[PDB]
RNA sequence: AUAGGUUUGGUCCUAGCCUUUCUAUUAGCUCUUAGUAAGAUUACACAUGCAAGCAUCCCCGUUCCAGUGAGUUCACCCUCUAAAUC
């Protein structure tokens, strides 16, 4: 149980944090246990599995007072390069994959909320010409059928065939006839 | 006629008023870094390099045009009532022919009612971003442009970052662009942070807004306090040109005011806080005499 | 804390050097073990000391008891300090290629935040010196004493920007991509400025290293390069 | 280290630093130069430094060399029409030779810019396909569109298993 | 490439057989009126023709 | 799919495809609609064909192409 | 490849994933596989509504006109799409299907009234 | 009439090229003669069943 | 569209004249080694129609593609002789020369 | 490769072998749910059922799609020019 869960950043300005870490990042003294001189290229999935911590928890998981929240800006700054603004990959600080994903999401949210500083470049305009006189962005002259309330083409509308042609079709397709259809409803029934 | 923002004379005044600080224009960027290179130079070569940097800064500080808000697009191409009720969602058709300006590009909508109409400005911008993606722009509006996040950005004095984001996201003549730029200018005016925009390409637009809205008192005060008297006088002249029928311009003509006299005439005629303008000018003159 | 390996003496800190008979204290200096060897019995130790502000040295101590060897090496090291010049107090002034006996060292100046991507002994020595951003490649025989000697020789024989400006009598102007075309004058001669420009060498006759060019062109295919590693 | 004097010549950066892109008429370059004699020094340097760049930018043009056949160095260009262009390079520097040949038979910057713009048209940003040819594989990579089911499962109502 | 002569031989003999076995209209367009099938091919005519 | 040399399935040797039933009014209206639609589409198609041919003409023997060629020749001379 | 006859046709090539279809409008030889070799990509079509409740169709109108003028045919779904865009007349079968749907809904309403 | 989008594009092209004509664009079909589907075709071009 | 022969204009050295009215010419091109990024000479033999039989072994000649091949391997015809073996005329000054020395001075004219 | 281990009474050099990293197949032991992607070792032999019709007769199609990797510079560019679409 943390008293800082509601308001995480206070923990970083509390004295206890100052004795524990001082001015150095919370991951400075971590060293990962592995075979060989070349580490594995991915960190462990999660240091907390079914509410049980591993023997060597990562910088975020060892200290339940450290809360990964987009408002905890001073903590998130410790996981971003101050010279390039790039989020460190997980092996760099040893954070587990789960906490690395959470930190990435928190950093992106803090940047989107304007709480975390990042380089915003100056870009050129999209359009060389800003005129809005073309017919694509203006009013096209209405067509006569549109103003008259008529369909664009006359054959869009149903026209009842003359009875002679219908009898001709009935002779041609005798024995394979469906019930004759009348004109459709004027508008779509609901 | 009344001068436009892009007039050569207005452009020259605003260019000189903006200034050119090479250190601020070419401040180090926080980005992926590479090892620097080194060159041995004489004094002449160093001066040539400095002039080339000044030219690059002039290109960088080119002002965005100030445009009027675009009129909404409400145009119907056809109404095929037969299609009414046969579809539940609208169709958006974008013409993606490469060699067409985006403002001449036909983008239409077939609604469930059967109406074939022209796409609105917001739909046009969204579709252009979808099919011709521009670096820095997002299809969905970023939340940074909400009131609270803009207030946070202003609290951090990141007005130039806000304007750069606005330029990247919105078109110059869109409602959102105008609203965000106006809010930034009002914040700068209310907390007197004009120096944030000096040596950038947004200073001219800020000055143009202040002049057309007749609130140049704060900027004039800042320029006097910063000993930029030429800038203050040019601001008064530009104000007179944009408002040639105002009592300030008539007073200047009557009194044959020139130089600081223009500022005094403006302070007595059309200044919301002319008393403080007079006080600051008097202090500046005393300091100049003492120095 | 452990060293380079669980059972290895290398990399382990020995604490500050003892107060010397001269009467000086060395509380700001840190000591690191670079090698411990059995001499056939006695013990020979190679240690390095450094204050993290450019002053650093190394020494060998021989004794029957290991702790006595540590003390001898540390005390002798503090009295044989090199001063290492650092560009902006984070890296070296230029690329340094050297050969000491059969060991080759290629060191590259790097921007801030790059880190120490170097042989582990080089990482230890650089941390003692105060270099924070550098690349280093060791080739030939990997002999620890030769590595230390060559490293210190090369780092002590680097020419600063001010030295180059005084030698050539010209402004040393730095160009950074993140700063655009702005020219940053990093050094100016104390004496007069030459008015004749440097010969614009159309093609310099420099000795290039095949590995660097191969890396530049994308023909390097090593599965071991650019591997994710812990912060150093 | 890299073998030979001036190894920088054998780097693609140097090879692409060339600025001579010949018009379609040029088919052959014959280069007559003298190994000894100060007046031909630039010509010799032209052979040493700039021929690799010229060939790199013009892979289909036949470049051939001739040594100590004439008292003076010169370049000869054979065009598709059968015309021959002779350029005396004696007393000239190699940079001057480059500038001269660029001026007389090299495509101007404007034509190269139109060629680059024509190239830009082939890779239409709207087209969807393999990353080798297109910016995006699928419309599901566009924000606001229905995402890939590999990453975000579709609602049960949109899946044939629970519609059948 | 080893020339393929059997292919040419097969093509020529097949062409010859075709030109010397051209069916006549009486065979091609005969019909069985009980089953409404072409005896030449065995294919049935469409229902709407029956 | 099957080839011409694959035997017919025994399950469908006695299968006769029966024609669908016809609604006379819809059938007649649909025939007229297809006639009008196809006339319109063929007109549009020949306009597109003529546009393509005209673009080829103006790309080969057009005035602008001729002037560009003359400019190139003049610069070469 | 060489085919015996055939022609170019502008059609819809299906990509995407299971339960998430997406179409590329391509001019291709009619004998080629559906999602195989094509001459040019003339646009795209997302049949699933997006977060704005829109179906997105991109049409390279210039190139579509070029290929129709070069003798390319059109598949029926492509013709219906072009009719919806207003580039062609509404296809006869869109109109007929609309009328059939109107009649079916009218029958359902009459059933409701009868009950 | 032209289809709605084609009509709009034609009018836009005219207006961009400076023309202010209000005459509706029209598609000519007197040259397209609707030939009935049951009109006799060319028996000379038709094929013949192959012997087998 | 003027010829079916790929190589239209090529300069080479005559290495054979043992045929009737046909010269065997050696053509060198520069090919970039993909690994070393150095240019090396690649040689190709061409047959050029010499109606007048004016070629001598060692002279530099220019060949123009025929409209169509006149034989299996004869696809080009001698447009001119760039450098006659041992009888070179300096193109720059127009004077006969022997190697790098003038046989007759330019000032003689 | 940022390298490491291993020859000797001992030091230095050279040199092989191996370790550390990332994939794929198979095997041992162990495995809960959901979405997606991919899926004989064998050009060895195959029971069985399907994979080509359409259409007022003529014609058209079954020469495509689908499969495999046995053989192996028939694939790309230019010239010329049939068949096919318009
Ligand atoms: S790749 Fe687009 S839906 Fe899967
Ligand atoms: K048929
Ligand atoms: K094979
Ligand atoms: Mg251990
Ligand atoms: Mg070894
Ligand atoms: Mg299959
Ligand atoms: Mg196939
Ligand atoms: Mg033909
Ligand atoms: Zn963890």
Numbering used by the authors:
A (entry chain O): 48 to 237
B (entry chain R): 66 to 356
C (entry chain D): 190 to 229, 239 to 430
D (entry chain T): 2 to 165
E (entry chain 0): 6 to 55
F (entry chain U): 27 to 103
G (entry chain M): 10 to 124
H (entry chain 0): 165 to 216
Reproduce the article's own wording on this structure.
Mitochondrial ribosomes (mitoribosomes) synthesize proteins encoded within the mitochondrial genome that are assembled into oxidative phosphorylation complexes. Biogenesis of the mitoribosome requires trans-acting assembly factors that chaperone rRNA folding and guide mito r-protein incorporation. Here we used cryo-electron microscopy to determine nine structures of native yeast and human mitoribosomal small subunit assembly intermediates, illuminating the mechanistic basis for how GTPases are used to control early steps of decoding centre formation, how initial rRNA folding and processing events are mediated, and how mitoribosomal proteins have active roles during assembly. Furthermore, this series of intermediates from two species with divergent mitoribosomal architecture uncovers both conserved principles and species-specific adaptations that govern the maturation of mitoribosomal small subunits in eukaryotes.
The human assembly system uses two GTPases, NOA1 and ERAL1, which act as molecular switches that promote the first steps in the formation of the decoding centre and the platform. In state A, NOA1 regulates docking of helix 44 (h44) through two mechanisms. First, an N-terminal extension of NOA1 blocks access to the h44-binding site at the tail of the mtSSU, which is occupied by h44 in state B. Second, the globular domains of NOA1 hinder h44 docking at the subunit interface while also sequestering h27 away from its mature position. Within NOA1, we found a vacant GTP-binding site that is partially occluded by a helical insertion of NOA1, which prevents the switch I motif from occupying a conformation competent for GTP binding. Our reconstructions provide a structural rationale for this biochemical data, suggesting that TFB1M activity is allosterically regulated by the stability of the platform, which is controlled by the 3′ rRNA-binding assembly factors ERAL1 and RBFA. This mechanism is coupled to upstream events in maturation as a NOA1-bound h27 would preclude platform compaction, ensuring that h44 docking occurs before platform formation and h45 methylation. The discovery of ERAL1 within states A and B enables a direct comparison with bacterial systems in which available structural and biochemical data indicate that the binding modes between mitochondrial ERAL1 and bacterial Era are similar. In states A and B, ERAL1 binds to the rRNA 3′ end with a C-terminal KH domain in a flexible manner, with the GTPase domain binding uS7m. In states A–D, the presence of both of these factors prevents compaction of the 3′ major rRNA domain, splaying rRNA elements and protein modules apart to allow for significant intermodule flexibility.
